[PDB]
Amino acid sequence: ASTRVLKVDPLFPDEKVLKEAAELLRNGEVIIFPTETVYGIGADAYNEEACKKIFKLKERPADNPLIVHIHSFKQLEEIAEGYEPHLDFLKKFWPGPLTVIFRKKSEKIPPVVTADLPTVAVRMPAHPVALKLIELFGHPIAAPSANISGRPSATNVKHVIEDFMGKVKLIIDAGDTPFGLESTIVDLTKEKPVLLRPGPVEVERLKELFPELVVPDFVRKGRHYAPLKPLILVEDLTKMEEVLKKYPDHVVICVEERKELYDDRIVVGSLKNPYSIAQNIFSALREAEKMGKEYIIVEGFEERGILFAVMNRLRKAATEIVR
C-alpha cells in the first residue's frame, strides 16, 4: 500500500492530518490511530466492505466482533437501545477506557461488525485524536486493537509498523498510549452487569458501583497477546528457581524491585507504580521475543487494581502457567 506515518500531538492534533484520515475512511480504507488504551485499526462502522478488510488484515476470526467507537452521546442513540437507565453511569466514565455491551438498534452497523450478534460493543475513547477523528469523519469507527490477531496489542507506532507496514495506507502516531491495556468491557444487557474484560476501569471500582457485578471464570482463568517465543507465567514466585533452571535458555520479564536477581531480564516496571507495568507489558513481550532466547519467563502479579488486567492478559498469552 505504501504506508504514511503521520505524527500528531495527542492533545491538539493537526486537523489536516485528521482530515486526511477521514478521507481514507470515507473511501472505505482502513487506518490505524491512537487511543488512551491501545492503538486501533479502524474503518467506517457503517461500511461492511471496509470492516471486512479489518478481519483480512488481522487474520481475525469472523466470530470475534468489533468495538464501535463514538464521540458523542447522540451517536449512542443511533446505534444502541436500552442504555437510558445507564446514562448516569456512562456520563461518569465516558470519554474513557470503558467499552459497554448494549442491544444493537442500528441497521446502519452491518452484521460483520457485530459478528451477527444482537449486541454491539460501544466505546467513547478519552483520546483527543480519536474523538476529533471520529467527529471530523462523521461516522462511528469500528476498530479492534492494532495487531495481528494473537499478537500483543500495539501501544506505539513501532509495534504497529512491525505488524502493518505496507498493509495500510495511514498510521497516525501519537506516541506511547497512556494505559497500555485495552478498555474494560462491561456487559449491561443482562439483569446483573458482567465483566467481560478487565482494564483501566478497575474491578474494585466496578464492584463499588455494581455490587452484583458478575466476574466469569474465563476472566480469572484462560491466542491473544502472545509473543513469538513460548511464554511461561510464574504465579508462584517460590518456583522461580525451578523454572529458570528447567528452562535455561530464557529471558525474564520482572519488576524493578527484583531486577538484580535474574541475569537476563527486561524490567517491565515497578510494583511501586503498577500503572508502569500495565503501560509497558505489551512492549516488554515484543522486546523479549527478539532477545534471542528460547523462552520468555514472566513474573506473576497480584490480581488487584490494574495488575488484575495485566494478569488477565498474561494468562491468555502464556504457553504454560506455573501456580
Ligand SMILES: Nc1ncnc2c1ncn2[C@@H]1O[C@H](COP(=O)(O)OP(=O)(O)OP(=O)(O)O)[C@@H](O)[C@H]1O
Ligand atoms: N457484542 C459483543 N459481545 C461480546 N464480546 C464483544 C462484543 N463486541 C465486542 N466484544 C469483545 O471485544 C473484544 C475486542 O478485542 P479486539 O477486537 O482487539 O480482539 P481480540 O479479542 O483482542 O483479538 P485480536 O488478537 O484479534 O486483537 C473481543 O474480546 C470481543 O469478545
Ligand SMILES: C[C@@H](O)[C@H](NC(=O)O)C(=O)O
Ligand atoms: C482500539 C482500542 O479502543 C481497543 N479496542 C479493542 O481492544 O478492540 C480498546 O477497547 O481499548
Ligand SMILES: [Mg+2]
Ligand atoms: Mg485485540
